[PDB]
Amino acid sequence: PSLSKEAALVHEALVARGLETPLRPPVHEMDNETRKSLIAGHMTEIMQLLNLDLADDSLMETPHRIAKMYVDEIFSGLDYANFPKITLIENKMKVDEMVTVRDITLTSTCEHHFVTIDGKATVAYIPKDSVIGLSKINRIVQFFAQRPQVQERLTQQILIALQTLLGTNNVAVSIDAVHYCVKARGIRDATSATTTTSLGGLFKSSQNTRHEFLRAVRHHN
Amino acid sequence: PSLSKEAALVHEALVARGLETPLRPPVHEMDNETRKSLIAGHMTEIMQLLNLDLADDSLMETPHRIAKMYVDEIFSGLDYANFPKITLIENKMKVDEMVTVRDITLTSTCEHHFVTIDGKATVAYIPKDSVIGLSKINRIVQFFAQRPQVQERLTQQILIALQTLLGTNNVAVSIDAVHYCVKARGIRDATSATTTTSLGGLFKSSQNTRHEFLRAVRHHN
Amino acid sequence: PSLSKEAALVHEALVARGLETPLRPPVHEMDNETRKSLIAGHMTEIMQLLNLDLADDSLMETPHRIAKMYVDEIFSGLDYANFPKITLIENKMKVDEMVTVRDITLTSTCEHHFVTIDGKATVAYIPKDSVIGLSKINRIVQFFAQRPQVQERLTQQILIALQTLLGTNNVAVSIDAVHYCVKARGIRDATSATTTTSLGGLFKSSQNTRHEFLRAVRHHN
Amino acid sequence: PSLSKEAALVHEALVARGLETPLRPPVHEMDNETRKSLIAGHMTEIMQLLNLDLADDSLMETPHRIAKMYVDEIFSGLDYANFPKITLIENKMKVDEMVTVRDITLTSTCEHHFVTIDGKATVAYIPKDSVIGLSKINRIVQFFAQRPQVQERLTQQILIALQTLLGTNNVAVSIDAVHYCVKARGIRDATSATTTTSLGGLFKSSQNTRHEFLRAVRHHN
Amino acid sequence: PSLSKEAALVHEALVARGLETPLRPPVHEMDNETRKSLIAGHMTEIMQLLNLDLADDSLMETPHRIAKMYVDEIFSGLDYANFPKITLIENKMKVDEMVTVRDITLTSTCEHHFVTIDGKATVAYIPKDSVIGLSKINRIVQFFAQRPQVQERLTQQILIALQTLLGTNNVAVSIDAVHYCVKARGIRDATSATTTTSLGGLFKSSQNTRHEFLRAVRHHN
Amino acid sequence: PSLSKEAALVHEALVARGLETPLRPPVHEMDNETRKSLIAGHMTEIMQLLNLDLADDSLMETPHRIAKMYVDEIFSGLDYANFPKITLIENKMKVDEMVTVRDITLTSTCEHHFVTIDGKATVAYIPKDSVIGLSKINRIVQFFAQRPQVQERLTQQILIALQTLLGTNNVAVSIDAVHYCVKARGIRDATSATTTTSLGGLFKSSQNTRHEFLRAVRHHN
Amino acid sequence: PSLSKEAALVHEALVARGLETPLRPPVHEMDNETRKSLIAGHMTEIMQLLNLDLADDSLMETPHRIAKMYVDEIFSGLDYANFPKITLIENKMKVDEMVTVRDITLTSTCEHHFVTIDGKATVAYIPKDSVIGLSKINRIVQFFAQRPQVQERLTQQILIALQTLLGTNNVAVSIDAVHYCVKARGIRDATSATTTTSLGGLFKSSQNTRHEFLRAVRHHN
Amino acid sequence: PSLSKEAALVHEALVARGLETPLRPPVHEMDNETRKSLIAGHMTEIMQLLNLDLADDSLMETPHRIAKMYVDEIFSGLDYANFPKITLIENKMKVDEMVTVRDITLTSTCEHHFVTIDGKATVAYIPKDSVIGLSKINRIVQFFAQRPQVQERLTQQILIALQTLLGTNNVAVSIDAVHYCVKARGIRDATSATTTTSLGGLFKSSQNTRHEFLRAVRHHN
């Protein structure tokens, strides 16, 4: 009817921990269509302020493309109506060891300059009552990634969302990414990459479990 | 006469632990030949529903090829009459350290979409009374891989099968694989890979042994 | 109203050259919904013939998942209603040298066994009157790849589709892919890869141009 | 009834060119079973001459294992009754550019010492009236590889067999391999590898075509 | 006069531990010359049973070449008359840390099928009263490698031989090898490799020393 | 008005620990302009002593270029008026795990010969009350790098500056670099590189945390 | 007595072509000792202008160290008294093919900023009447490298020096280097590298010879 | 009786071309035993001149070891009595394309300083009437390598020896090597390597053949 049981749960969990993305309730019920047009409008003004000849065929549709990109694509994660459908199967296999999904493609945006964050996430968890569909993990990562982020927050959000859905605190998330906020401009460091990890349950308590995960983290190319 | 002592033991072990692949007893004794033909028929219908011109020389034999592939090849692991012949030699060498067989080629099928799972397995065990033929390890892995799987279950099954045959709980199995269920369709993540491990005996108890194995797991290319 | 001007053109071009995928006209106007359900039914029967216990939570939804994957995903390319929207900008830059888009991710299906084909395509063309949006090239490749293919045909189709849309014969397509039809079963060759190329215009005529393209073809990892 | 049309053709072609493996007609019609037993007997004698304690469980079955390996496995190519089934589809795609199958796994035996030859073959051909199933190429390479060989002969044999089956002289075969005949014993050169190529049709005549193929030959790891 | 003090010691040590290669005392004092000729004879028969035309110049000398290879080369390790001369210098340097010799080239034969085993050994030891010439370590490895082996036994044998000669139990041997018994035939796994280790003294007792060695084990290419 | 609160704090902290770069108070208030001209003058004399023909168009502006490089570029870190603007956000994410910024491009000058030091730094810290902007870390590293350094001091300085700004002693800095002071002249060692680390807080106290950081240190290329 | 016949020849050759480093005749005969002291003085002033506390033990000797480095090391190539001794042997081997010395370590200084240039040179020549000692080539490269350079000139100088000494115009020189002038400061491009080549004789005339050389140029790491 | 027909032929061919190693006829028929002892004596004197305490157990046997190494090992190539036995088989395969043996391990000695030369040779030839045993090529290379060499001569010698034995001028030899004469001392260039090639027949005449060979030359690691 609006948000799925999962979307609701995850959202509440995040709000409770104070880990939700800084959002303000919708001032007025606007259709995404009207928001897009308004954003497109402001973009048109910014491009004109930059002295771009909006009459050019190639630049003409840009304000609209950017508006759609924001509302529908790169910032779609802000709307829980886009939360993926979660499928869980009973842990009949009686798995008691961690399942690790590595090198998940992740593309996000640094909220301080609205510039690309390109990286990879490694998620691992120890199955309790249910096992989650591998694809679902990738989708959850993408969801939170599609928001104006701060890697420190992004990692935390993914962790909690998964803990909530899997019903286990034994979840670990590690994200290694390149920030164009740092590379493409400013200090323009062409080689640095940032790594942030958030560990829950045994992954934080048990040094044994913690290190097994950390050792598995990151690969090459 | 039907199933070898080994095939029987392994099958029982799996059923006991409740780790056997979800199978229903044969409704009627059909020849694999009749099953193949029946499967071929259903495929013919599916292809027709997809509007494929089955009159084309290249597509003509597909329903049969698929049927044979299923029954004889990719799902042959479901029939214990195909279980490999196990050869064990007396551990006169008095080996007390683990023997590791790494990078075993593994090709399986994700049962949720019947799509390719391509990866590699690393198996290790500490010889007790007998040492197994290296090739047999690769064969057992392939056997269980030739079934509609769920990586979490596949890893478990191989572990138990080996424990049963070697007569030692000191066995460890780690499988790293790419699921086309995730890559080729759905979220289409082109870089993620899943790693699952199942540890028995000392490999689970002894942190020392456990880490020695984990440290050896995985290589490159 | 049905097919876009582009979809129609490409389809006609393919039929004219006799390079279209072997298709029979829809016997009856069935909703994709009814086709999916029918396919799901045939799958149910096949799985039962394989003796799989469809009562298992994990296997239960498979017949439906496969049906949807076929109609909506992996074989969606058979329906021109799914042809991407093509955007072309005027070649005001007066580009006379080839534009190469390399390492396009490609996932298709070998029609002889309905098994995964995983590879990468390198497409190049010399802009005439218009320049195409880079993303569109990737999209066209994916479209044709989402069909029961034979690499030799796939390469040809992409070539013609591009030539038609760009209005230039100067297009070159090279595809390097691994066939699980070969790796996962049958001879089980774990290392072979197939490369097929289709050259048009100067890429075939001019040895100079031809080699410049070929030299650029393929990379590593 | 005995040999397939294909097996016969290929065999004749090889005999005609005087490129067949040095074989003598079967002195007497012996069952492979009796041959294996005889070979096993000779091996038993050789092992005893080496002073190996054949009473040892590990060595006990070796004479039989070696006999079966020779007759059924590594030298099976000597019997045309094992020639693969060739599937050819009409070249409706009108492919006029070469199709290259690279990195075909190849394991053979150096006939001068009966020691392992491990390598990879690259085969390419320009489709005339028919296109061959990719897997079939790998199979044909394996067939001729499963014989006491001399790389110079092996490459020639594969070339001819393919030209004959495809009905085109435009075929090229290149094999790069490590001979344990050289590495494991004798001079014990741990790094050398031998590369041999055989070119037919345009691949030999047309310098353009020749170099395109040669440039594609060999990869890494 | 026959066997050196070293050869005798090592042989006795191996027989005591029951780690010697399964050998039967020479039934009759035969010259290696007569043994070679007899082996050559049996080989002639085997090749004839395989229907090879022994009249061919290339195949003609094979029976003799194989016989010499067996007796003089690949199985020479069976004769302690071929044991290397060991040179030991007084540990005046007062070395108390381990000396590691890595990537020792090792070529052996899997006794179950008489096929090539190609790998590399890493040997380490903590000097007590004497230091051994580095080359000697490679020679001892080669000696035991030149025998019909089972990697599990090979590793053990090298360990004991070294312990005996160095007069220290603090020796560690690790061998990583590819078995063509597995790759070239049978299951034909093109990627798996086996690793076996045998640890003596501190390398087994001291977890600290043990891991330092294990961490050093294996390199790339 | 002169130095920012941050610049002042950091400077004081360094002086307090006695880790500041050996500086003498400005003998007289000179404009950077006059300093540059004076430096350029001395360089002119040096070049003349080296017998370089300063009348050459290429060498003519060198004295000035060097002077500007020293004052404005490579030694600009000596003037705290160039200290970066630090942005800190409240640690609302409640991050308790370390944030690692790896492969920070670092170019400094070995004060003993005024020759290039080219390397990379890895910085990590455990957020207390505030999280710092990733780029800022790179900037601080660059700041101190832009001074006549001694890697041992450089590492210490970056550590302290960070501890001061973040208000946490839990900071770790590791720098790996190539000194042309060693490579380009003198002993001319073309392969050596120096690695220095400075650990604060838990990174020094907790062996667990210390090793997690060290394990993450350094990558390739 | 002063300059060797070789030094004289090379110097004259360069002067004639107008390729010599911009030098002014020594204004007065000063001992390198007095020049070093004078330079050291200028450096002391420059360091003081930078506000460096020369009282510090580490910085104290810097002015002298830099002065010695300039006169004796990095700029020693400016004095032909340092020209290496050239050894040539009669080309009795009758070599008519090119001899290539690749990956020659080269460290020079960009004269526009007096900053490090780190790279590698590849030199090749076709022996005429004499063959030069390989080491001598490396030495000649170093000689000219030890000067305030401009890569374009450096390459030309080495070419001519070699042509003169070898008595053959058939010489080719290629230098690939990284300029810290670009990396460490200014635009700070961390990845670019400059390649310059100078070709003499057949290496310029004969396209065949030219490309053979160029194809050989550059390697990795 | 002394020298084989092959050794004789090769020696004559070399002397004819004036490519033989500078040798003087044996002044007196001395046993290698007496020569070794004499050399050992001179070495004893040299070591004593270096002030080495020959009473030390480790240095004691050095003069003898060196003497034996010279006469029996590293310089054994000077004695044609050590020339390998050449085995040639009739080119019944009718090979008309070149056979390439790459990465042949080569270790020689730079005659100017008697220091190690470590490299790899790539040999190729077009079979005329006979095909040579692959191992023989490696052996011939080693033979000439075991002499005080100059890479330019070494390459020439191998070329001629092969041309003579194969009865074809179509032979090509390329040697890439590192000279410790350059690396370990003198200029101490840690990265340079020398490549020398000698081409015969078509490999020199036919630009097509020539480049095919050259393009194949050299690999990595």
Next chain:
Amino acid sequence: PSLSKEAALVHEALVARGLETPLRPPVHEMDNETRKSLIAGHMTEIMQLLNLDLADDSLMETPHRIAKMYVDEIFSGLDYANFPKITLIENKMKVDEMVTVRDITLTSTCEHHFVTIDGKATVAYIPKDSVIGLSKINRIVQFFAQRPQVQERLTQQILIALQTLLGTNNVAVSIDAVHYCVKARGIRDATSATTTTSLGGLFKSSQNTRHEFLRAVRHHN
């Protein structure tokens, strides 16, 4: 006046521990010039015994070159008059963590055959009262490397020399090298490398420190 304070200290330290290279006091005060000439003479005789035509221009100067190489270059470490000048700066930085200088180029000679040893050393130490110039470490390594060595001794010598000069026992030295004594001759193992380590102070006592060092030891290429 003869030996520096440092040279004397280091020499005494080594002699005290009995780790000095086996040397006999100079029998008579000979000029290095006369020693070189005497050595040259003995070499002349050795070359003549090898039947080398010393009249050849290329071989003519060899006896002298070798004599100079021995006395002035490769064995110059035997004379403490060649010990490097050590520069130490006060540890004002208050460095308490280890400084590691890795991949130090090392070229020595195996005293048992006087053949090249090519390797790399990794030296680390924890600064006490003074910090040493990085280059000095490389120089000290080279000094001891320039002597007839046994890797086991070489490592020990470097360790002690450093401990003595730095006034700290907290020094660790690890050397990984390839011995041509093993590769170029004798067993001719083309892949083995030896690794030796000597640990002082905390590097031996503290398992924590010990492992931090060991983990950092060795890199690739």
